[PDB]
Symmetry: D2
Subunit: 226 residues, 4 copies
């Protein structure tokens, strides 16, 4: 199998754990707490802001013109905002998205994930290292959305069902581009480099698990100790 | 006087030197050599595309989402934008613009200029250091364009008069956008920081002087020796 | 005046004080408590040494990245001296733990490893080294290393629970004095470099220090419980 | 022919231009002006901290301990060592070295040179790109020194003959160290990468030409009229 397929396949057991965790389970059932939704939406916004800086930092690493335009198109898509899935969650908890995201939320797991993406963006000249760190985001969401649409436990009577419907189709184009880039950018990489890039992808899949759960448990930096 | 206006005012004596140099003087008269025009257009196209990276590098330094939109707009222009002034010079030498710019040209003076921008983008946290290295260009060209329109040496029978006409009006908004960006970014800078930022601006005005003159003298890295 | 001190404290003192409750938690956690007693498992020792060797390698790189941020040539000389010292090889504290488990140090530590907690700590130090111009941001991210170790070492030397019959007592003894110069230098640098920082910058520098103190707690606990990246299913 | 030897051979025509320029020719004759000597020594002293930064920036890029030790030893030498050739020039103009270097000098040609080194240190993960930007210096001085010792135009009665004598042998070990480092670090580089690394070396050889000439002509950033 190809490099990106190997990464995707290696990540699937972690995605199964995400799907079976409390955040996604409660969201599937249309019973996720207001607090978990709020903390997720607030954090998600902080993470997404950095995912955009990361795209910008990849521009100088690209030699191909098509790859640069892809990155710029992504930044523009991220700057437009108004993602239908966020509106679904905002509606679900009866708070406008504008009012919810006025309170910023890098809890510890977010800080780790974001600093993982930045480490690669600063330290590695080959964009594959950073792409591998960001790619689990759309892949995880796609797998979850598609699975939910065929899960007999999907609560179709809740507006939360539209969150899964959104991710079941809207990530595929981006997943395909990231796979093509990882496959192409790693052709001349050594086995030690490919191992590190693979690890970046698996770690980011774990970071995704921790990101949903961070919202679920209201994870905070506990500076007062015990 | 605001910081951005202080910088622009300080750059004026250098802009006067640029105006009186052979590139602009010969262009005013519609007498600039085809070689000088061709090399200038090649270098301009080569660096415009490279500036994409500098703008991209400043996106993470901006706290304002409107400043990020500005940077993304400039990237789009570097990638797929057209400048009517290019067509004017292409017509002047009777060659298609897209044929002229097939050959990339990276002279020693251009290397210095782009590495000045990169140093600031890499090394300095405050985007002002890099914005000050990029901002002189539109002001240099605006000053030249406006001055040329009232100059007795302007050859109005040559299509080159349209190059000056273009620059006399089409840079003013960008000069203002850069002024507001510099004033806001430097609101809380120290005097030492301001001095360094001002120096970046004056140096880049000199880099613009050399950008014209490197085309004028066909400046090359002399790797092969015998001077 | 009001710029230099907050509630009667310099900036470095404020940070140190804010971190102390976390250090108390570290001292009373299983890793340090077992080590105090000379009862820390051989497995925990090996896990600690492997991760710590990887951490110290990166700590050295962080010092190198601070050099261009320093305006003073005396500060550059201090950093170069620290790097030179790091390159001489094996911290004596590591040899003490190897002796405690009756194994040669070179057979214990063979490969690079950044377990989850170490990975976070290292990437936090690097973020600051790459992203922040003022060296204070990076110094704040690294300073809990010598500070935590100094506080623990000094506390242990006075603690009646210290097992003085075990060679592990020498680990605490080493840290009770060998970090003092570095703690002093880092405190001086933090105080000097933050003189003209905004309240927002100071808050972020302070959070870097407290985060790194939490990272120190997690680093010891990572070794204690054999924390590792779990890439398989059913976790 | 090794990669590093290819670079050095390619640089020779530039070094021939340097040797025939005013700075070296006047120095050969024992008549280089006091002002040129001071400006040269001041520039050399002024960039020492910047060169130190460049070496420090390469430490994290090295996989080998022995390469890290080399970089640290270079920094140590620069910070704590003394270059006898500086004392020879100070003696030549009858001014103490410590007095000459009280004033800093950062000319336009020096700004170009240092920004070329920094560009590479920041942008290129492989240290070879920056090493190639640094390595010409000792080779330029070695070639000049050895040529001077066989040149009948050398003023052997002037203390300046000792400057050429110093450089005729004191750079050779560093030239060799840089050779071996470039050969090792570029062993798996693409032809595109090698072309860029070679260009960095040739550009730095020209920067060394301008480092001497900027002292010779008292080059300045002229921010005012004319």
């Amino acid at each position: 199998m190809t490099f990106s397929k190997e990464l995707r396949e290696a990540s699937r057991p972690i995605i199964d754990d995400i799907y079976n965790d409390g955040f996604i389970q409660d969201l599937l059932a249309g019973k996720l707490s207001n607090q978990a939704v709020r903390q997720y939406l607030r954090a998600d916004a902080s993470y997404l802001k950095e995912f955009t800086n990361i795209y910008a930092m990849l521009i100088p690493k690209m030699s191909s013109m098509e790859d640069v335009k892809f990155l710029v198109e992504q930044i523009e898509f991220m700057l437009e905002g108004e993602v239908e899935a966020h509106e679904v969650l905002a509606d679900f908890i009866n708070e406008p998205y504008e009012e919810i995201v006025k309170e910023k939320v890098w809890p510890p797991s977010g800080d780790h994930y974001i600093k993982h993406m930045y480490f690669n963006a600063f330290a590695r000249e080959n964009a594959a290292f950073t792409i591998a760190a960001m790619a689990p985001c759309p892949y995880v969401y796609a797998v979850i959305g598609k699975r939910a649409m065929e899960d007999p436990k999907l609560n179709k009577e809740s507006v939360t069902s539209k969150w899964f419907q959104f991710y079941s189709t809207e990530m595929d184009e981006l997943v395909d581009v990231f796979d093509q880039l990882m496959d192409r950018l790693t052709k001349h990489c050594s086995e030690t480099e490919k191992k590190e890039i693979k690890e970046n992808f698996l770690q980011s899949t774990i970071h995704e698990r921790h990101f949903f759960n961070m919202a679920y448990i209201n994870e905070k930096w506990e500076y007062g100790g015990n």
